[PDB]
Amino acid sequence: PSARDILQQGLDRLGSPEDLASRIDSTLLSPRATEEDVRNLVREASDYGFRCAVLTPVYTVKISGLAEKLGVKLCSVIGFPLGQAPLEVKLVEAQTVLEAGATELDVVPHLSLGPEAVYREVSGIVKLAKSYGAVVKVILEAPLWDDKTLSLLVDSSRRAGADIVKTSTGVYTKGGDPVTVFRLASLAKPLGMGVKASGGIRSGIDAVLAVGAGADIIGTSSAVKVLESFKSLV
Amino acid sequence: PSARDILQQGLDRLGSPEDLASRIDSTLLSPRATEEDVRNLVREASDYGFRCAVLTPVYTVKISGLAEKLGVKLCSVIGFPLGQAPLEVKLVEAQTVLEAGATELDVVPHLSLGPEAVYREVSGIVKLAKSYGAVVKVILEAPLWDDKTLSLLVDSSRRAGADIVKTSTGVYTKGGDPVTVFRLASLAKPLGMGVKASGGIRSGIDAVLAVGAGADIIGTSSAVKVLESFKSLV
Amino acid sequence: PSARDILQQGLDRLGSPEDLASRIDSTLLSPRATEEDVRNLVREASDYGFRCAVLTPVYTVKISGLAEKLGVKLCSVIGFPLGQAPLEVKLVEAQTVLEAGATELDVVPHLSLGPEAVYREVSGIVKLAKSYGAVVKVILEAPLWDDKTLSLLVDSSRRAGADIVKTSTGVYTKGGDPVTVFRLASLAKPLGMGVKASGGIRSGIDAVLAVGAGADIIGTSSAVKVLESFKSLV
Amino acid sequence: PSARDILQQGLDRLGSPEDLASRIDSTLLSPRATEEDVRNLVREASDYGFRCAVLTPVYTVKISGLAEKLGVKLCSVIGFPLGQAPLEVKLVEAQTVLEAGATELDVVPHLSLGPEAVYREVSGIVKLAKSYGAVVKVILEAPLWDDKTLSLLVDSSRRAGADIVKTSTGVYTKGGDPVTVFRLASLAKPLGMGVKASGGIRSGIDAVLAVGAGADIIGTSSAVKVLESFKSLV
């Protein structure tokens, strides 16, 4: 795609602030995040109509009550952000979050073990997830691998039953840029998988470019600012 | 302007690679730059049809012969990048480059001395530049000032007779982003002055966004990559 | 302490490369780390006589056989690096690594829930660790808190029965610098707890400075370079 | 040298705060620096006994009166920080500063033109400088070149009549670290040239390590903090 292609595609897909808001997974995954910050995250998600609230396992559970009351979908990260705890540990972690009402999981598999291990690991998590009717997004840290390796990873995710593939944890890499988004999307979309872009998305512009590049969902810890920035540059 | 506004404005103005190449001030201002590098810069500027080649005073002089032969317009930075040498020094520097054939000057005034001082100083080099029919672009390091102060600097530049105002040196600040570009453009355009965006412009998308925000000229040390990036994202 | 004080204290404690190597927790906690990399880490730990090898739960388990064969002590990070999975999850994770032979745990508690919560949580893993005669190092992300808050965290760690307190995860903060190390040490040592410095320790000089500031143990992903750098600056 | 060597050497040379203060060239070379900041720089230089005040040409001239009254030696940067204005322009610049009372010049030659050009250029500046009994420090941007090239540069400076060689402009590179300081010192000292380290020196510790590595003079824009940091770590 050309530069013009990505800009035009973004414009074709985001006609209104509501369109953008509906694609944003409002996130809070900071070592400093308090219960108060989490409450504010969920309330604002409802206030602005964001796709869902993304939290760590503990806060997902603690805030599930309020989220249910306000009708805010909850997404929890799993084995995040390093992803090198054993499969059993991630399942116990996913279980507690699923039992609490979380309907989506942003999973970090043990990527460095290779495509086959990722397939076996993700399949195990998707299995638990399906029993709750939960959606699984697989974080692939795309900036770390070449295309051949990213393809193998996307394919293992597909074969595992995953719905969406995510570009980055936003910790070890950043994947909110058009190039990284396109690298993942050019592989995921043909297979019918959704695409989530995350990492450094701070402006409405950043958001529109990511969508134009192929992202279906926008992950960001600055959801409100991204939305306001979309409406007005300054 | 909204995020959509700047994207659309960028698309409306840059329909072809030629349109882009025509607005690009291909630059080389590095402590590592060699004569060989400069020859390559000027030759490729000719190859790609870039707006001009931007160089330091010494290389502007050394390459003037080649530039003339290949029909490449030359632009020299003056008092770059700190701008705290006295006017007398800057005038001697400009005089030498003008004597060599440079038709544009990207001047860094002693900004921190205040709007009035900038007015007097720029009025001086503009007077000199005019005798050679050369254009003057005033670098204002926009990211350093609030809107009130930037307006004062833009106004002084206008009063002094300058043609264009530039967002940044790319050294002490980076002003290639849409917000910075708009901040300057919103003030300068109503006054009939041109706007040049510089600082961190590495992709074709960066270029299109800067133009959409109001930049007439794009300054970049990666002219070739920006152009190729414009044609193909990856 | 004065700058001279920390330098002198560092020199007084590290007379030989062996003294240094003996205080180094050779670490590998990367999303890119492969089994091969881990084998190399453990083998070189043996070669250089490093204090132990620090790994993620999965690799701690996979390498336990080799580690035992080469007589390399194993330390696993727990709930690393964000620490916001519930205690139950962290306990399962620790249990598996302890079952494999790990004798030390570098634990990341859910710091942002407050001192009291940290006390209860750490008391839990310490109880488990004790049944295996394993040592527990509590990561406090010192750079994130003021002295009053850090003191509260140090005190909770002490009350919970932890042996050592660690300055940082090396991910959300970097705590290998003398100031951070002293901030922690000034609080922990008077309480009889050990101090581990981690985050950005790349040179032998970084190591000596951290020890001079009060670090008993040095955590680093560049163990070999730190040692060689200790022997020769260049 | 070993890590211990550099720490011990620093301690041998900096026994008191006064020792450190006497080696510090208190600097202010910011695009934001105002006349008020400059006055404060000079007053404090006297207050703490720093070696001298380092300023841009314009401020050197504007503050010379006060500096003379307080007995504060003045050092001006020349052709700083890019160094690619012609020799004649730098001489006019050096002249105005010398005529004002500046007794030291921190010169940035056009390094990328090669050793021979640097020799011819520096000789020209040293010539003007000697007539005022002024000292010349030649900035070599050491981090940019290999040892062979740095040696050629140090030798051209020596042959040119320069007194001191400086590691960095602090703009295009940073040379306050032990490694970079040693690289320059191991070449300069045998030839009897002084050594100035600059770039990122913010702590008393940073200062002591640089001296231990061979720096005779410490350039820093945080002179007061470096000195206070030397006396007390926190």
What is the DSSP secondary-structure string of B7-76?
A: HHHHHHH--SHHHHHTTEEEE---TT--HHHHHHHHHHHHHHT-SEEEE-HHHHHHHHHHHHHHT--EEE
- Separation in Å, CA of D157 to nearest CA in chain C: 24
Which two three-digit tokens encode residue D161? 């009549």
- The answer to whether D and B touch (≥3 CB pairs < 8 Å) is yes
**Are A3 and B230 within 8 A, CB to CB?**
yes
A98 CA to centre of own chain: 17
Distance CA B132, CA B96 (A): 12
Which experimental approach was used here? X-ray
Long-range contacts made by residues A67-73, C-beta under 8 angstroms, separation at least 24? A67/A42, A67/A101, A68/A101, A70/A42, A70/A43, A70/A45, A70/A46, A71/A46, A72/A42, A72/A45, A72/A46, A73/A103, A73/A104
Cβ contacts (< 8 Å) between A176 and chain B: which residues?
A: none
Interface probe with B: pick from A9, A146, A180, A234, most Cβ of B within 10 Å: A234
Catalytic residue of the set A73, A90, A137, A166: A166
Domains and CATH numbers, chain D: 1-234 (3.20.20.70)
Alpha-helical segments (H) within chain C: 3-13, 17-21, 35-48, 57-70, 87-100, 115-131, 147-159, 178-188, 204-212, 223-231
CA A218 – CA A178 distance, rounded (Å): 12
Interface test with chain B among D30, D41, D56, D58, by most B beta carbons within 10 Å: D58
Residue owning tokens 């590998």: C28
CA distance A130 to D43: 72
CA distance A86 to C71: 24
d(CA A48, CA A18): 8
Closest by CA to B192, choosing from B152, B227, B164, is B164
CA nearest neighbour of D33 among C147, B114, A146: B114
Phi-psi bin for A214: left (phi > 0), alpha (psi -120 to 50), beta?
A: left
Q: Which of C25, C90, C106, C137 is catalytic?
A: C106
Q: Could you tell me which chain A residue has the CA closest to the CA of C80? A: A82
Burial bucket for residue B51 (CB in 10 Å: 0-12, 13-18, 19+)? buried
Q: Please state whether at least 3 CB pairs lie below 8 Å between chains A and D.
A: no
- Number of Cα atoms under 13 Å in the Cβ half of residue C67: 26
**Would you list which residues of chain C are within 8 Å, Cβ to Cβ, of chain A?**
29-35, 56-59, 61, 80-86, 88-89, 92-93, 96, 110-113, 141, 144, 171-172
Q: Which residues of C touch D234 (CB under 8 A)?
A: 1, 179, 182-183
Peptide bond connecting B86 to the previous residue in cis, omega within 30 degrees of 0? no
Test B5 with A205 for CB contact under 8 angstroms.
no
- A148's CB contacts (< 8 A; 6+ apart) are none
Chain B partners of A2 at a C-beta cutoff of 8 Å?
A: 204, 230-233
Token pair in block for residue A71 = 């009708």
> Each residue of A33-60: b (16+ CB within 10 Å) or e?
beeeebeebbebbeebebbbbbbbbbbb
Chain A positions contacting chain C at CB under 8 Å are 29-35, 56-59, 61, 80-86, 88-89, 92-93, 96, 110-113, 141, 144, 169, 171-173
Tell me the shortest Cα–Cα distance from C27 to chain D, in angstroms: 21
Is A196 one of the annotated active-site residues of the chain?
yes
Q: To one decimal place, what's the resolution in Å?
A: 2.0
Q: Looking at A25, A106, A177, A206, which residue is catalytic?
A: A106
> In degrees rounded to 5, what are phi and psi of residue A142?
-50, -40
- The alpha carbon of residue B14 is apart from the nearest alpha carbon of chain A, in Å, by 9
Q: List beta partners, residue A194.
A: A164
With contact defined as beta carbons under 8 Å apart, do B218 and B201 qualify? yes
What tokens does C182 get? 């002293």
CA distance C162 to C119: 10
Known catalytic residue at C148: no
Q: Are residues C76 and C97 in contact, defined by beta-carbon separation less than 8 angstroms?
A: yes
Inter-chain CB proximity D89 and B57 less than 8 Å = yes
CA B152 to chain CA centroid, Å, is 20
- Name the 3-class secondary structure at D84: coil
Type of residue at A51? R
State the Cα–Cα distance between residues C45 and C50, nearest whole angstrom.
Answer: 5
Catalytic annotation, pick one of B25, B90, B106, B177: B106
Structure tokens at C11: 């020199």
Asked whether the beta carbons of residue C56 and residue A82 sit closer than 8 angstroms, the reply is: yes
Measured distance CA(D90)–CA(D80) in Å, rounded: 9
Give the side-chain half-sphere CA count within 13 A for B165.
Answer: 34
Note whether B164 and B216 are within 8 A (CB): yes
